[PDB]
Design a binder for this molecule. Structure first.
Ligand SMILES: CCCCCCCC/C=C\CCCCCCCC(=O)OC[C@H](O)CO
Ligand SMILES: CCCCCCCC/C=C\CCCCCCCC(=O)OC[C@H](O)CO
Length: 426
């Protein structure tokens, strides 16, 4: 096929190898925390002390699986703070040095993250592994940047859809494999996928930013440092607005508006998506195995919609499809929030899947069309960073309201707040 097919193919297979490696360990995390608690790990005990303080503050009942999910949520949140910190820098660096050298630095970091975990099963090794993997998770935003390097709006909108399929397939099949593996072998499979991704990208990712299109600098002074690290400067896209041939006027307002909608969407969606672990236990007494089955079906529907519908939306129709998805999430979360049987829960999950499939891909696709050739890493790095900030705060704030106000209070209120990104877009 053309050179555009070849790059997206390499980006997709690389990213799927990456996401299998990460998601593989997620169904095992409950057992690994429980092991540390049971060995009296005094560092574990520190963090358990923090989760406890939080559990007391929000009024969360004392129960093994409620603790497991809350601890997994603090851990998930700390990790997203690392992704937020590093995504703009990694982007700006690649704008200046090319996509391939920075993609490869990031993958050596991810491979090293799994080398560490492989060697030691302590809470310390766990956090050391998460820290390194966290600061090296720019490979994700570099994938979106590489798609944004492509020539046509069509190339880009389909590229972002294909990345959507990677995340949906990765988050589906990874935990499936992990729970099928003997625990000893799991960190070895993560390593195999992470080393495979590194080697695959080394041999097959073509460069999509030529030397004569690159940003002259990463950051010259403290104001440029702050442009990559301040949540408000990342919302205002100040790093992009201060680059070579940047967007200005109406074009720069639009970029900011898509970013605010992106952040708000993911703040709300990531919160309800996390607290669905509370709702399916508390209301329907789902085992974590049954939560496995449910997220599996969600991921498969999402990959189908992403591959089949999201990927076929005519360039120019991204925004119309996002507005329709944000409206669909109002009934979707009302049905989940209030449903007292599996048919009603099921209907809300189906709408959840159709709507979530479209939003991240369609918005990335429109955002990717902004910035000059040497700013694609800074634009998509800034977008990923806003998502990371959103997935950092979303779970914690939804957990507070879920336990302080109850499932209905949280799911009704978050449902209402979806009209904020809907109206910001219209
Ligand atoms: C390149 C990446 C490699 C760097 C790893 C560095 C130091 C760890 C050296 C190994 C020390 C192991 C600590 C003992 C431990 O983890 O406890 C017992 C273990 O869990 C039973 O499987
Ligand atoms: C380019 C970089 C190359 C790679 C550089 C590697 C750096 C990794 C450093 C520290 C993490 C290792 C932590 C090892 C944990 C030691 C064991 C421990 O903490 O105690 C065991 C626990 O009490 C019960 O098993």
């Amino acid at each position: 096929q053309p050179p555009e097919r070849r790059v997206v193919t390499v980006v997709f297979l690389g990213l799927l190898l990456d996401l299998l490696a990460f998601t593989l360990l997620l169904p095992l995390l409950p057992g690994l925390l429980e092991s540390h608690g049971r060995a009296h790990d005094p560092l574990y005990g520190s963090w358990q002390g923090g989760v406890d303080w939080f559990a007391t503050a929000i009024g969360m009942p004392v129960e093994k699986r409620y603790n497991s999910v809350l601890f997994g949520g603090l851990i998930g949140s700390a990790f997203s703070v690392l992704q937020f910190l590093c995504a703009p820098l990694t982007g700006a660096t690649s704008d200046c040095l090319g996509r391939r050298p920075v993609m490869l630095l990031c993958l050596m970091g991810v491979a090293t993250s799994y080398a560490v975990w492989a060697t030691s099963r302590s809470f310390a090794a766990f956090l050391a592994s998460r820290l390194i993997g966290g600061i090296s998770k720019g490979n994700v935003s570099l994938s979106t940047a590489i798609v944004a390097d492509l020539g046509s709006p069509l190339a880009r909108s389909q590229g972002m859809a294909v990345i959507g399929v990677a995340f949906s397939l990765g988050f589906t099949l990874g935990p499936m494999l992990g729970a099928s593996l003997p625990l000893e072998m799991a960190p070895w499979f993560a390593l195999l996928f992470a080393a495979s991704d590194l080697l695959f990208i080394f041999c097959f990712l073509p460069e999509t930013l030529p030397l004569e299109k690159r940003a002259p600098s990463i950051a010259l002074g403290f104001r440029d440092a702050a442009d990559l690290l301040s949540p408000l400067a990342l919302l205002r896209f100040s790093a992009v607005a201060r680059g070579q041939d940047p967007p200005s006027g109406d074009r720069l307002s639009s970029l900011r508006r898509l970013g605010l909608v992106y952040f708000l969407y993911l703040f709300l969606f990531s919160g309800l998506e996390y607290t669905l672990s509370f709702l399916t236990h508390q209301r329907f007494q789902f085992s974590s195995l049954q939560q496995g089955k449910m997220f599996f079906l969600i991921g498969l529907t999402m990959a189908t919609i992403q591959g089949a519908y999201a990927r076929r939306i005519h360039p120019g129709g991204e925004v119309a499809a996002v507005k329709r998805a944000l409206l669909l999430l109002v009934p979707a979360f009302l049905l989940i929030g209030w449903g007292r049987s599996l048919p009603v829960l099921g209907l809300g999950l189906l709408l959840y899947s159709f709507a979530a499939a479209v939003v991240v891909p369609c918005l990335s696709s429109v955002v990717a069309g902004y910035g000059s050739p040497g700013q694609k890493g800074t634009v998509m790095g800034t977008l990923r960073s806003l998502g990371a900030l959103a997935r950092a705060a979303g779970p914690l704030v939804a957990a507070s309201v879920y336990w302080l106000a109850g499932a209905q209070a949280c799911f009704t209120t978050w449902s209402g707040l979806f009209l904020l990104p809907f109206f910001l877009l219209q």
